[PDB]
Design a binder for these strands. Structure first.
Ligand SMILES: [Mg+2]
Ligand SMILES: [Mg+2]
Ligand SMILES: [Mg+2]
Ligand SMILES: [Mg+2]
Ligand SMILES: [Mg+2]
Ligand SMILES: [Mg+2]
Ligand SMILES: [Mg+2]
Ligand SMILES: [Mg+2]
Lengths: 201, 186, 105, 180, 146
RNA sequence: UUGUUUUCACUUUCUCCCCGCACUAAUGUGGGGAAAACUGGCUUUAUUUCUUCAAUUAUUUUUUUUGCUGAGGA
RNA sequence: UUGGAUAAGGUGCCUAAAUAUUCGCUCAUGAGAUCCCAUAAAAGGUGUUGGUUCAUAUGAACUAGCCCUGAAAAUGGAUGGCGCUAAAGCGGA
């Protein structure tokens, strides 16, 4: 929490545990950018979560539904609203904190070339026994009328190809640098070579 | 309670090629290739190529989990049977007053049904991938559905039987329909 | 290159409180690399500086400080309670402070 | 040495009798062995059982010894068989159970946890009869037979348990549960 | 007997689960007061409890430990039925296993980190000076290559 | 109702033999039978910085780093 | 008024303090979440976990923990909210 901005990819995290760890970072003061929100997991069967969303959809202001609960079915807005329900968003400071979060589906330009981190205390692999049931947020949002699941995958394929080429070039550069390093050790005063040898550099 | 180890052994026949990597299985043989995955249940299976006998082993387990070992073993045995001897399902179409008119099109898929209880309409089913439909060479009212995969052929045979279910009459008296009569191999 | 650091970084959290009560005599501070109670006790006597900016000049300059001290830990995770000469304004709860190292041992 | 792994159960040896009177001046002497948290609780249970089984109330008795029996081979592994009696919501029952441990009270601690977990039985409704050591050829339960084969081996399949300091909340590569 | 064919064949089946629990496993300790030390399994009590003993070489006594506080390592010593501390010390001394762990990928990094943590001010500056010297040779060989 | 007194079980080994001849989850295994005292246990020394000398209680003596306060004026 | 240390209750976020440790149980196509306190029964289950008897290692009977059926109302709604299943649920340490 001592950085200008952190970037988190949410592929493989459970919704509640991730949303709880983001809210305290926001309250303490930290910008957060969350990407790949369509790959978030929840800890029930897909049908059991579709029923819960159907319960959410049928509560509305009787006299005028323009007001009242607004049902947002993109995956990124779902996490946005789940975090909003863990902040004191009706004061001033708690509204300031809510504005320091940005959410995306996919991985647009500025962040496709930045470093992404993960939160191990929210990863499904470490938190859910292997004989339990779970669903994916993209499938659920499609089942309630989102309509953009396919295009995101189509774009992710291209992004991954470009990243693969970049990684190839990076590995070549690293090997070329390792050779230059190993040559230059022979051309230094011996005592500097011992002091580098002793401390494992 | 928990049990430390439990194992079962399944032999490989003579004319079969096998491969297992991450609980993903492929088998090959005279009549084609079959693919199947098992990445939803905790097992580490061991394949001995020089000998036969894939082996399935499970560490600490409970009665509800231990019941899935024999299931996997039987699925493996069935797909071994599939590639050396295709599965066969025989079906008899039985009528009382109106004879049933069958018709196979499209390279031995897509059976067509006419005159079921004399109704002037046409009913279709279309076989699952890998399954071929044909009528018997010996007897009048037999259809053969067959080939290489027990699940696909048995479910095609089931799709045919439920094609001609009888509506709101007494079904202990109106017995017309198409029924599975024998299960064997080719 | 220039302007050496010679201090450890920190963020000022709220006051010492419960649910629904305030007690603004002490303030809670978080230290950058400290996340156990045993390690937080290492800093238990150091001097704290909170430096901020204004818009007018006050004595020829546009910067002023409020001095404080590290008094104790706050329980199991490396947070501390600090006592300042004047109470910290609540419009500062995400800002920076300098955990100095002057009173050396 | 590690106070996060200790249980608070010890064993005691208590001896008692009644105050001698003009009608009775060589009264019987009684002994018991009790598992408790401290010696005061053990004396409490001793007088409870004296009153219930014999006609001895504390206020006209007298205590003679409290000794706290210790364990002779605290690092060898034994097999233990326990006899119980506990009250359910709709009756009173009695059972036999078996444990594996290195100390008798190390097994009594397990027994209390198992009886809370499996049956929701509180410590106040449980009476313990006859802890004893049993040989390995007279074991009756299937989950003890598992552990006494010729050559015991198995892989370790737990998730890691790290120190609080290296439990960094915001990581740079997603870890693995395999660990071979 | 078994021919060479079967023989190497036994030595070619890389099993999924290596590193079993048994008398002689190494088990760097990960949680608790004795965290960051080495030890040995000498007996197993239940599924979850294990008796552990690092001989008088390491600073751990013979004691009981929950199994979830351990990390099994590659090295195992073939020790006997119900060994005690005295014979275990002799066996670990004669087999020379501790210092062949120190040559692995993880022992080297543990030792190097400990070395770095004990450095003084002058030693830190010496490391900085050596790196600054090395950078010049880097950047002159580079400019020669292109 | 207690103190003696007898009977038979209790140890595993990377050793040997027979049967299944590779059958195991295992760089081994299932059934049957032997050997030894390496390992484990017990005696007599003469020893404690190779190593250990613990834990709880009773009774005593110190120690590192630091927060807050300075009433009175004989 | 200034310091210190608690009670009753709490320690995933709202919200100051444990995503603490160490044992068991539970999967719910209407789970559950503790004085007062804000409802549920008789009768059933070849769900799963322990236990007690009678019968050459298979049958039968019985018993009690969590879960399920019995279980229908009027504006849109309430374990306080989010949510939570390697619990942030229930019984202990
Ligand atoms: Mg307010
Ligand atoms: Mg209020
Ligand atoms: Mg001899
Ligand atoms: Mg006060
Ligand atoms: Mg609670
Ligand atoms: Mg908090
Ligand atoms: Mg029955
Ligand atoms: Mg709570």
């Amino acid at each position: 929490m001592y950085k200008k901005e952190y970037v988190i990819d949410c592929k493989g995290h459970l919704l509640g545990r991730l949303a709880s760890l983001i809210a305290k970072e926001l309250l303490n003061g930290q910008r957060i950018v969350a990407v790949r929100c369509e790959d978030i997991n929840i800890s029930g069967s897909l049908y059991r979560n579709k029923l819960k969303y159907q319960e959410f959809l049928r509560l509305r202001t009787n006299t005028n539904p323009k007001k009242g609960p607004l049902h947002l079915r993109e995956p990124s807005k779902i996490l946005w609203r789940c975090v909003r329900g863990m902040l004191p968003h009706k004061t001033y400071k708690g509204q300031l904190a809510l504005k320091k979060l940005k959410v995306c589906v996919g991985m647009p330009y500025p962040y496709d070339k930045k470093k992404k981190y993960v939160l191990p205390s929210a990863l499904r692999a470490f938190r859910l026994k292997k004989h339990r049931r779970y669903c994916r947020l993209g499938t659920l949002s499609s089942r309630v009328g989102w309509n953009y699941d396919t295009l995101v995958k189509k774009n992710e394929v291209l992004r991954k190809q470009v990243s693969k080429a970049y990684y190839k070039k990076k590995v070549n550069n690293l090997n070329e640098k390792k050779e230059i390093k190993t040559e230059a050790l022979n051309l230094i005063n011996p005592e500097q070579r011992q002091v580098l040898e002793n401390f494992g550099y | 309670m928990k049990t430390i180890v439990s194992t079962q052994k399944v032999l490989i026949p003579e004319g079969v090629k096998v491969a297992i990597n991450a609980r993903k299985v492929t088998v090959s043989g005279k009549y084609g290739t079959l693919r199947r995955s098992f990445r939803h249940l905790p097992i580490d299976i061991r394949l001995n190529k020089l000998k036969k006998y894939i082996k399935v082993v499970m560490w600490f387990g409970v009665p509800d989990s231990l019941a899935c070992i024999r299931t996997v073993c039987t699925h493996l045995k069935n797909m071994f049977t599939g590639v050396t001897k295709k599965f066969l399902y025989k079906m008899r179409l039985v009528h009382a007053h109106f004879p049933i008119n069958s018709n196979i099109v499209d390279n031995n898929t897509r059976i067509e049904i006419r005159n079921y209880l004399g109704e002037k309409s046409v009913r279709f089913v279309k076989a699952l991938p890998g399954v071929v439909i044909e009528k018997s060479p010996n007897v009048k009212d037999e259809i053969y559905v067959s080939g290489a995969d027990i699940e696909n052929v048995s479910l095609t045979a089931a799709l045919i039987h439920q094609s001609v279910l009888c509506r709101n009459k007494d079904i202990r008296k109106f017995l017309d329909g198409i029924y599975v009569s024998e299960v064997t191999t080719v | 290159l220039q302007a050496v650091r010679l201090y450890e970084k920190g963020v000022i959290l709220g006051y010492k409180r419960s649910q629904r009560n305030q007690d603004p005599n002490f303030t809670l501070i978080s230290i950058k690399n400290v996340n156990t109670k045993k390690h937080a006790q290492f800093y238990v006597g150091k001097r704290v500086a909170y430096v901020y900016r204004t818009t007018k000049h006050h004595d020829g300059v546009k910067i002023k400080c409020i001095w404080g001290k590290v008094c104790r830990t706050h329980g199991n995770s490396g947070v501390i309670r600090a006592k300042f000469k004047t109470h910290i304004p609540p419009k500062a709860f995400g800002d920076r402070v300098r955990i100095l190292m002057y009173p050396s041992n | 040495i590690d106070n996060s792994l200790n249980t608070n159960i010890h064993q005691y040896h208590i001896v008692g009798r009644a105050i001698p009177t003009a009608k009775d001046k060589n009264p019987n002497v009684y002994r018991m062995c009790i598992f408790a948290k401290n010696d005061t609780n053990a004396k409490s249970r001793f007088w409870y059982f004296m009153k219930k089984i014999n006609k001895l109330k504390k206020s006209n008795g007298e205590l003679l010894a409290c000794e706290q029996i210790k364990e002779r081979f605290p690092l060898r592994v034994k097999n233990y068989g326990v006899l119980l009696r506990y009250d359910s919501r709709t009756g009173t029952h009695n059972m036999y159970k078996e444990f594996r441990d290195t100390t008798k009270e190390g097994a009594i601690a397990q027994l209390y946890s198992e009886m809370a977990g499996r049956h929701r039985a509180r410590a106040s409704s449980i009476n313990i009869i006859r802890i004893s050591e049993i040989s390995s050829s007279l074991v009756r339960r299937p989950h003890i037979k598992q552990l006494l084969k010729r050559r015991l081996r198995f892989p370790a399949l737990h998730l890691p348990t790290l120190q609080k300091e290296y439990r960094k909340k915001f990581a740079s590569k997603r870890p693995s549960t395999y660990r071979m | 007997e078994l021919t060479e064919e079967e023989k190497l064949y036994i030595s070619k089946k890389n099993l999924l689960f290596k590193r079993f629990v048994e008398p002689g496993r190494l088990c760097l300790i990960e949680y608790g007061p004795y965290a960051g030390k080495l030890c040995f399994i000498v007996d197993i009590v239940t599924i979850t409890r294990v008796i552990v003993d690092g001989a008088f070489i390491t600073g751990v006594p013979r004691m009981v430990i929950p199994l979830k506080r351990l990390k099994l390592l590659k090295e195992r010593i073939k020790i006997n039925k119900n060994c005690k501390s005295g014979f275990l010390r002799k066996t670990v001394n004669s087999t020379k296993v501790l210092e062949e762990f120190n040559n692995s990928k993880l022992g080297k990094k543990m030792i190097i980190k400990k070395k770095r943590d004990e450095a003084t001010d002058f030693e830190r500056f010496q490391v900085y000076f050596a790196k600054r010297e090395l950078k010049k040779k880097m950047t002159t060989i580079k400019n020669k290559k292109n």
